[PDB]
Structures are given as C-alpha cells and as structure tokens.
Amino acid sequence: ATVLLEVPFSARGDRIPDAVAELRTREPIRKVRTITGAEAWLVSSYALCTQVLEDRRFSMKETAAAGAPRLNALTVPPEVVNNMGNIADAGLRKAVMKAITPKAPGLEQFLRDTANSLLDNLITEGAPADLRNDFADPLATALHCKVLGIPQEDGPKLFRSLSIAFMSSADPIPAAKINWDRDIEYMAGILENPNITTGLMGELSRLRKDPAYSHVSDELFATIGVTFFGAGVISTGSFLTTALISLIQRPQLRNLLHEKPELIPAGVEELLRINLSFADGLPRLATADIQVGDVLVRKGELVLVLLEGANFDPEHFPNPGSIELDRPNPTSHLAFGRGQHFCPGSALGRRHAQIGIEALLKKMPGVDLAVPIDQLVWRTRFQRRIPERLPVLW
Numbered sequence: 001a002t003v004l005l006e007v008p009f010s011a012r013g014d015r016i017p018d019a020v021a022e023l024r025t026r027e028p029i030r031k032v033r034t035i036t037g038a039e040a041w042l043v044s045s046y047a048l049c050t051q052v053l054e055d056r057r058f059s060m061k062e063t064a065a066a067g068a069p070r071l072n073a074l075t076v077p078p079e080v081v082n083n084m085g086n087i088a089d090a091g092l093r094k095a096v097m098k099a100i101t102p103k104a105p106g107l108e109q110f111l112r113d114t115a116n117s118l119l120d121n122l123i124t125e126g127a128p129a130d131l132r133n134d135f136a137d138p139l140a141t142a143l144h145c146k147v148l149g150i151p152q153e154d155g156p157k158l159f160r161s162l163s164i165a166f167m168s169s170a171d172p173i174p175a176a177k178i179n180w181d182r183d184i185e186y187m188a189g190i191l192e193n194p195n196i197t198t199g200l201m202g203e204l205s206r207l208r209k210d211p212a213y214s215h216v217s218d219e220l221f222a223t224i225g226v227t228f229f230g231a232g233v234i235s236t237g238s239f240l241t242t243a244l245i246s247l248i249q250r251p252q253l254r255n256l257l258h259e260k261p262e263l264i265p266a267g268v269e270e271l272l273r274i275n276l277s278f279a280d281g282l283p284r285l286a287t288a289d290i291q292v293g294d295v296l297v298r299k300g301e302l303v304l305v306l307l308e309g310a311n312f313d314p315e316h317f318p319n320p321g322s323i324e325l326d327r328p329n330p331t332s333h334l335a336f337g338r339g340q341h342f343c344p345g346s347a348l349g350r351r352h353a354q355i356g357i358e359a360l361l362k363k364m365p366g367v368d369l370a371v372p373i374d375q376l377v378w379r380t381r382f383q384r385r386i387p388e389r390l391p392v393l394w
C-alpha cells in the first residue's frame with residue numbers, strides 16, 4: 001500500500017521528471033495530495049490546462065476562502081489574493097498596465113546599462129561568478145525600482161523579504177507578516193513622499209489625490225506597490241536565472257544567439273515555454289460541478305494547473321523538450337497563464353530576459369557552468385524553482 005501521489009514532484013528546475021509525461025498520457029487529471037494534506041486535482045495536458053484557466057468558474061479568489069482545501073498557506077491577507085480584481089474594481093487597471101510596460105522612454109536603455117554594469121563588475125572580480133545573486137536578481141531588482149519610481153538604494157531591503165514571502169509552506173509563516181507590514185509601511189510612506197513623481201508609485205500618488213479615486217483605500221494603493229515589486233522581482237529574476245541554465249547547457253544555441261542576436265526574442269519565447277520556474281501548479285477552486293476530461297470536479301474542490309504539463313505536451317508542441325526557434329505556435333505556451341488572470345507583466349518579463357541575455361552573450365560569449373550541473377542547490381518549499389547560486393566561468 002502506498003499513499004496518494006504527493007505534489008510537488010521535484011524542486012529541480014533543470015529537468016522535467018519522467019513522471020509528468022506518464023501522468024499526462026494515462027491520467028491528465030488526477031488526484032494528488034498537497035503539502036497541507038489537502039486533496040487536489042492535478043491537470044497536466046495542454047487541452048485540460050487551457051480549459052481550466054479559461055473557465056472563471058474555476059476561481060482564483062475563492063482559493064482564499066476559510067476552510068477551503070489549500071495548496072499552501074497564505075503569505076498575504078486573504079483580500080490580496082484578489083489583487084488584480086481589487087485593482088480593476090478601483091478603476092486602476094489601465095493606469096497600472098501603462099506603468100509596467102517596457103515601452104516607457106529610457107527604460108530599455110536603463111536595463112541595458114544596468115546589465116552591462118553588473119557584468120563588468122563580475123569580469124573585474126574574475127571567475128567564478130554567481131549569475132543569480134550578482135546578475136539576474138540585481139537586474140530584476142533594479143528594473144522594478146525604476147518601474148515603480150522608487151530609489152535604487154531601497155531595492156535590496158525590499159528584495160530580502162522575498163525568500164520568505166514566496167515560500168510554499170504547509171503552515172502560516174510569522175516572518176511573512178512582519179515583512180509584509182514593514183513593506184506596506186514603506187510603500188505608504190512612498191505615496192506621501194514628494195520626491196516620488198515617476199513610475200507606478202508616482203502615478204498612484206497622483207491618482208490618490210484625484211477626485212475620481214477619492215474613495216479608493218490607502219491600503220490598496222500601498223498593496224499595489226508591494227505586490228507588483230515582489231511578484232515582478234521574484235518572477236523575472238527566477239525566470240532569467242533558470243533560462244540562463246538552459247542556454248548555458250546548449251552551446252550550439254548560445255553560439256547561434258551570440259552570432260544572430262535578432263533571434264534572441266524567438267529564443268526567449270522557447271525558454272519561456274520550457275521554463276520550470278513555477279514550483280507548483282496554478283491553484284483554482286471550483287465554484288460549480290464541472291466536467292474536466294474524465295473527472296467531474298465538485299464545487300469547493302481545489303484544481304492545480306501544471307504549467308509544464310501543458311508546455312511539454314507533445315500533442316501541442318511536437319518534440320517538446322527541444323528548443324526550436326521556428327515553431328508555428330511559439331507564443332501559445334502557458335508560461336504567463338491564460339484567460340482572466342493572464343500575467344500583466346508579460347511584456348516587461350520578456351524584455352528583462354531578452355536584454356539580460358543579449359548583454360551576457362556580448363560580454364561573456366564563452367559562458368559555461370563552473371560546477372557540474374548536479375551541484376546546483378535547488379530551493380525547496382518555495383513558489384519558484386531556483387538554484388541558490390549559479391556559478392559560471394567564461
């Protein structure tokens with residue numbers, strides 16, 4: 001006798017477990033147990049993943065309901081689970097979107113300058129270099145300080161919340177509340193700070209005083225700053241880090257992108273498709289009884305949408321484990337989700353990765369791992385899969 005299959009399967013972000021393809025073929029929706037001890041339906045085919053994400057009867061906001069089966073413990077107040085819905089309801093969705101596009105004047109130049117400065121410092125210090133802690137994460141942090149309009153010098157302290165804030169824990173995390181409350185206080189001060197006139201926080205500070213937003217709560221304005229910083233930083237830094245691993249392990253691709261940098265955006269799209277940065281399936285709670293494949297999901301049950309299930313499904317992406325720059329459906333992956341909750345930072349995230357890679361290949365065309373790949377230490381019980389250090393030589 002064996003216990004019910006447990007998720008997640010592996011914290012390793014450099015290979016997909018052979019188990020995923022077996023499940024997809026035999027039982028593309030099947031029962032699993034989460035770290036909390038709750039039961040859930042794990043969905044692993046492209047067809048079923050899309051079905052779930054496109055049906056709002058599978059609710060994100062209801063995952064925060066008291067008494068619901070949980071993937072993991074809340075690390076924010078339950079209202080913050082509906083963050084984008086609260087933003088929308090306050091009339092702020094267009095303004096937030098506009099602030100977080102990579103089209104702002106000078107933003108791309110800033111990214112390229114920051115990336116080049118980080119790499120120059122690594123070259124000066126000499127090999128081995130840690131591309132996570134000393135490149136990808138500081139590049140993500142600098143980008144989000146600029147996008148938010150907050151001082152660069154404030155980035156590191158906000159960044160140090162994230163190793164706890166994005167934990168995937170069975171139980172509530174006392175440190176997460178301490179850091180949340182502190183970061184909220186910081187963003188509330190930013191909104192009252194007359195020096196802050198650019199970026200997302202500059203725009204929120206203005207809208208706060210406009211009569212059309214006089215009844216929007218101060219709690220929401222501060223929340224938007226904390227959540228967009230955290231979500232953007234953890235996502236872009238984690239994605240770039242694990243994409244660099246995939247690229248480094250493919251010298252032929254590294255050489256092609258070095259030689260033809262106009263292929264970088266197609267490259268990043270394939271790196272997005274094969275990315276294992278999300279450690280857990282995307283959670284949804286059924287609000288009705290809904291047929292998904294061979295299973296009738298009952299109202300109040302938890303469903304987990306496995307992104308790598310969808311993105312390595314050979315029925316949608318033939319030869320799924322291969323990077324192919326000429327697929328006919330290249331942006332049809334689920335790396336940014338799908339439907340109501342599609343990532344509002346998708347363009348910024350693509351641009352962060354494209355620029356980080358372009359700059360790396362120009363400065364370190366011979367970049368290679370400085371340790372055997374099995375020596376990378378993969379962070380556990382976290383909402384992302386990331387190596388603690390990424391040592392490289394060049």
Ligand code: HEM
Pocket residue numbers: 060084085100228229231232233235236239277282283334335336337338340341342343344345346348349350
């Ligand atoms: C490569 C980078 C990124 C990846 C791979 C990524 C991935 C995702 C995914 C898969 C979702 C869907 C979640 C769901 O449906 O449950 C999502 C939503 C979200 N992303 Fe990202 N993201 C990235 C960058 C960003 C950035 C830069 C920001 C903000 C600055 C951001 C903010 C958000 C927010 C606020 C949501 C929730 C949207 C909603 O609930 O309607 N992300 N992202």
Ligand SMILES: O=C1CN(CCCn2ccnc2)CCN1Cc1ccc(F)cc1
Pocket residue numbers: 075076080081083084165166226227228230231232235343
């Ligand atoms: O606003 C969001 C959106 N998230 C969607 C999935 C994760 N993600 C992040 C980026 N792209 C996808 C869920 C979590 N929150 C709230 C939050 C933000 C920051 C923090 F530190 C703690 C909680």
